């Protein structure tokens, strides 16, 4: 509610919903993974 | 346990049973349209007093959890079990006589309805009793997409609108202790606090 300062002198990891199939981890490697990029039809799904 | 509790329970049950009996008799007589031995032949609803229009309006239902001293009667038990409202349809002419009975035990806009639907998010799913969350829209499509529901937003829209998912979804969908929490509960008790012929209290 007031100016307590005034003038003074003092990232993602490609986890998209529709990423390239290479980014998506394979099912076999998902066991070793124990967030992952996944493929989805669209934003609503 | 002292006899006072059971005595109060019996007295409250008798009083509320008589109150429900008068309401049922009045409704039955009104159904016959013989407005010659009843105080009020028409219907009313209280927000102020408002006339009960025949339009099947849909409004949210809330649980009041009481009167506690009144042991729930068999009719109220069955009504709550059918509506699964025991845990703490529409306003049609055939639903009002049953809603009025459970009136003492119970009591919007798009902003409230959308938030409530998207926050509660009950979804019956197969263990068998799973009801965790609105996990994915694809679940609705698989279980309910055949009715024209591609996502939960369709259910929300059809509930707000006079659609069919409003009815279909029925088969698919201070509170503390300690000294600090006693004063707030005592204050809320004032807001926490019924004639048969009187209008329904909302």
């Amino acid at each position: 509610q007031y100016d307590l300062w005034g003038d003074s002198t003092e990232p993602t990891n490609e986890e998209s919903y529709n990423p390239p199939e290479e980014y998506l981890l394979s099912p076999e490697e998902k066991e070793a993974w124990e967030f992952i990029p996944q493929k989805y039809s669209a934003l609503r799904k | 346990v002292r006899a006072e509790s059971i005595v109060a329970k019996t007295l409250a049950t008798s009083r509320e049973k008589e109150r429900i009996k008068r309401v049922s008799i009045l409704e039955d007589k009104k159904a016959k349209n013989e407005t010659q031995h009843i105080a009020s032949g028409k219907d009313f609803i209280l927000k102020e007093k408002t006339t009960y229009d025949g339009k099947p309006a849909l409004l949210f239902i809330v649980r009041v959890r009481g009167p506690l001293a009144v042991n729930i009667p068999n009719k109220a038990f069955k009504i709550l079990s059918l509506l699964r409202l025991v845990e703490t349809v529409k306003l049609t002419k055939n639903v009002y006589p049953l809603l009025k009975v459970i009136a003492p035990y119970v009591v919007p806009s798009l902003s409230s309805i959308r938030s409530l639907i998207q926050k509660r998010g009950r979804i019956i799913y197969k263990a068998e009793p799973h009801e965790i969350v609105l996990n994915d829209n694809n679940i609705v499509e698989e279980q309910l997409g055949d009715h024209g529901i591609i996502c939960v937003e369709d259910i929300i829209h059809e509930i707000a609108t006079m659609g069919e998912s409003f009815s279909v979804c029925n088969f698919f969908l201070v509170s503390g202790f300690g000294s600090l929490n006693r004063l707030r509960k005592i204050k809320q008790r004032e807001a926490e606090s019924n004639a048969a012929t009187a209008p329904v209290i909302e």
């Binding site: 002198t9 998209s16 990029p37 669209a42 | 798009l110 998207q118 591609i150």
Partner: protein, 243 residues
């Protein structure tokens, strides 16, 4: 050097910069015992009568630009609580703060990058994140204190930003601002909104397989910020992170 536990009890850290730092939270404890006394007395009027961080913000952030260092976590927590034993009033206040911040951002349109992700829809002004409008399936006391501090900071931040009603019932500088200007969009159930129903628009947004106001998908806007290849029903591009 004084150990963390020893320093906390006295009040690894440098003693020189901690000893001087020893100087209402402690006094508030008396309210609990006063309330207990009032409850014991059996009368509530005295309880009602008894019932009836700016300083830390300045030292942590002596200047407004310094707030950007922690604004990331502040906005993260605020948006997480906006969609989440936290009291309903706290959730409402957190949601209101986020809505006001978004409204101010839209007023200036100071947005440069966006990225829809599984975790949530990322944004850049400074980067911030918000989760989806779905229910979220730990000691919340730490979370509550962090939310309180971040809300106190954001109050002053919003005051500075602003210095420099039936809708409630329903709810040049960059290519983002330069592009889409005057392009009034129409959004379907998935600017005018169809949800309010419960034309001058040049484009229409819909993702359903079946459709009847050019039909465009939000992926077009996302990629342009980060209908050439976004006609309804067609496969969207990989949607790679701009960063």
């Amino acid at each position: 050097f004084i150990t963390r536990s020893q320093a906390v009890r006295k009040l690894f850290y440098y003693a020189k910069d901690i000893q001087y730092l020893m100087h209402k939270f402690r006094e508030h404890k008396t309210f609990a015992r006063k309330l207990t006394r009032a409850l014991g007395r059996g009368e509530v009027s005295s309880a009602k009568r008894l019932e009836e961080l700016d300083h830390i913000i300045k030292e942590r952030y002596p200047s407004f630009p310094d707030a950007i260092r922690d604004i990331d976590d502040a906005l993260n927590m605020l948006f997480l609580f906006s969609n989440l034993q936290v009291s309903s009033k706290i959730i409402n206040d957190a949601q209101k703060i986020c809505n006001q911040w978004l409204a101010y951002v839209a007023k200036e349109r100071l947005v440069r990058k966006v990225f829809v992700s599984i975790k949530g829809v990322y944004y850049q002004a400074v980067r911030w994140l918000v989760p989806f409008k779905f229910p979220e399936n730990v000691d919340f006391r730490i979370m509550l204190t962090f939310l309180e501090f971040y809300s106190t900071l954001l109050h002053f931040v919003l005051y500075k930003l602003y210095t420099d009603l039936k809708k409630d019932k329903i709810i040049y500088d960059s290519p983002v601002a330069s592009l889409f200007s005057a392009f009034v969009f129409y959004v379907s159930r998935e600017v005018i909104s169809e949800a309010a129903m419960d034309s001058k628009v040049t484009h229409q947004i819909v993702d359903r397989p079946v459709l009847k106001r050019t039909y465009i998908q939000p992926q077009w806007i996302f990629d342009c910020i980060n209908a050439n290849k976004y006609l309804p029903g067609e496969a969207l591009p990989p949607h790679l992170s701009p960063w």
